[PDB]
């Protein structure tokens, strides 16, 4: 029984492990984000990247030894947040949603530190994740080594995966609000204000509208 079966072995402990440097939280809209980035709460980011923080603090000499680095993290001074911002700069993180049906269930993003306890997810990718904002949760892993960084930015980055592996068509198509806004914008009406006046370009069109 210990060997065979789900609860026993191979499935559970040899194909279904439990990694470190991982987290979970509720997903949220965050419209202001760029397609290639994701909002990440400060406190989880600090907890995850703790050892990086210690390494950089010791490199800069702000702390003599590792215990002093720990104490400096537990006070949380401005320098710590500055170092965290600097280290996070190009380091990408992996986002995963519980039923990973296809390879788009795991994707890499560049995190941006934000307040709050909710993860901010770019809208366009929700269709790929089959994600809905009704209490769905997501897990977040951190690639450590240099090869992992290169792999995340090259193979897994959002901008490199625009076509579905199943068929060639685009996956990231606008879903509901975007198409409604554009539709409203483009439809014409027989008669309104400024019918049939001639404009030298779009810039004065915007001048007129605003």
């Amino acid at each position: 029984d210990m060997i065979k079966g789900k609860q026993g072995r191979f499935r559970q402990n040899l194909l279904g492990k439990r990694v470190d440097y991982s987290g979970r939280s509720v997903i949220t809209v965050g419209p202001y984000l760029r397609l290639h980035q994701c909002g990440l709460p400060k406190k989880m980011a600090l907890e995850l990247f703790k050892p990086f923080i210690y390494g950089k603090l010791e490199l800069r000499g702000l702390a003599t030894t590792i215990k002093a680095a720990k104490k400096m993290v537990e006070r949380e001074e401005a320098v710590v947040w500055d170092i965290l911002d600097e280290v996070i700069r190009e380091h990408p993180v992996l986002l995963n949603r519980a039923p990973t049906l296809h390879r788009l269930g795991i994707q890499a993003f560049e995190p941006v530190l934000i307040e709050g306890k909710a993860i901010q997810l770019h809208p366009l990718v929700c269709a790929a994740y089959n994600a809905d904002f009704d209490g769905d949760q997501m897990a977040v892993h951190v690639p450590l080594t240099l090869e992992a960084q290169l792999e995340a930015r090259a193979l897994m980055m959002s901008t490199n995966n625009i076509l579905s592996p199943a068929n060639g068509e685009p996956i990231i198509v606008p879903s509901q609000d975007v198409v409604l806004g554009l539709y409203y914008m483009t439809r014409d009406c027989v008669n309104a204000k400024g019918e049939g006046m001639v404009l030298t370009g779009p810039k004065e069109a915007e001048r007129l509208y605003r």
């Binding site: 419209p31 929700c126 809905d132």
Partner: protein, 248 residues
């Protein structure tokens, strides 16, 4: 609810969360712990009647960690009839079910912050403090009898700074009303140590210094990591105890 169905009073009354009058009378005394009512002569027992007193229950922990608090509705000198709602249970008002709160909504897309089923909320709602709930955790420290010796609840705890003792009384229990944080020592307990076999000169040194061979280990409970609140209540259950403890 601004928009109900009328069934609210039936549900609220039939659940046992409200306090409802059994024999109608007049409210004699009103406090935020008990309501004392003088019975009406009709329902008044001839022999050995007296008056009716309803003690309310204040914040205790429910199974789901929510707060269970009752508020009085009535005032001094008001007449009450059998089957009226004296005290409001959790999330009920004057007999009616009030599960949530009614707010002014507007249906429109506001720069895709309500893109999907997500909801936008105004800072006025948090300012007015209308969606803030109280939760309640319970913690238990158990002192058993080992065969190496019973553990002790004393405040003398090896190699702890006096900061940790500051909030403990002489008996070893937190003061009611103290604000605690993660990692603070909830209660003091000592693990017995045996076969010390100290040298006689070492025993003399221990005697002068006061070091205790019996202790040297701490089984003291600590606040779980990352939870911080106020101690509202303490209870003590003693199976054998020679005498009731101070706190008892």
């Amino acid at each position: 609810p601004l928009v109900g169905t009328g069934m609210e009073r039936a549900v609220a009354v039939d659940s046992g969360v409200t306090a409802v009058a059994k024999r109608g009378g007049v409210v004699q005394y009103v406090d935020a712990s008990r309501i004392v009512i003088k019975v009406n002569e009709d329902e008044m027992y001839p022999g050995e009647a007296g008056i009716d007193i309803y003690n309310l229950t204040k914040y205790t922990r429910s199974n789901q960690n929510t707060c269970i608090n009752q508020m009085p509705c009535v005032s001094l000198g008001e007449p009450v009839e059998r089957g009226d709602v004296l005290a409001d249970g959790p999330s009920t008002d004057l007999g009616e079910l009030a599960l949530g709160q009614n707010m002014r909504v507007a249906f429109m897309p506001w720069n895709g912050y309500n893109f999907e089923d997500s909801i936008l909320v105004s800072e006025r709602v948090v300012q007015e403090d209308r969606f803030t709930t109280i939760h309640i955790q319970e913690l238990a420290c158990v002192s058993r009898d080992t065969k190496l010796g019973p553990e002790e609840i004393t405040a003398d705890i090896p190699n702890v700074g006096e900061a940790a003792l500051s909030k403990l009384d002489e008996s070893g229990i937190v003061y009611i009303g103290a604000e605690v944080t993660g990692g603070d020592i909830l209660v003091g307990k000592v693990t017995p140590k045996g076969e010390t076999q100290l040298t006689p000169e070492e025993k003399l040194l221990r005697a002068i210094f006061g070091e205790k061979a019996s202790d040297v280990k701490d089984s003291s409970l600590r606040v779980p990591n990352g939870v911080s609140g106020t101690v509202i209540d303490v209870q003590v259950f003693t199976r054998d105890g020679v005498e009731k403890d101070k706190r008892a």
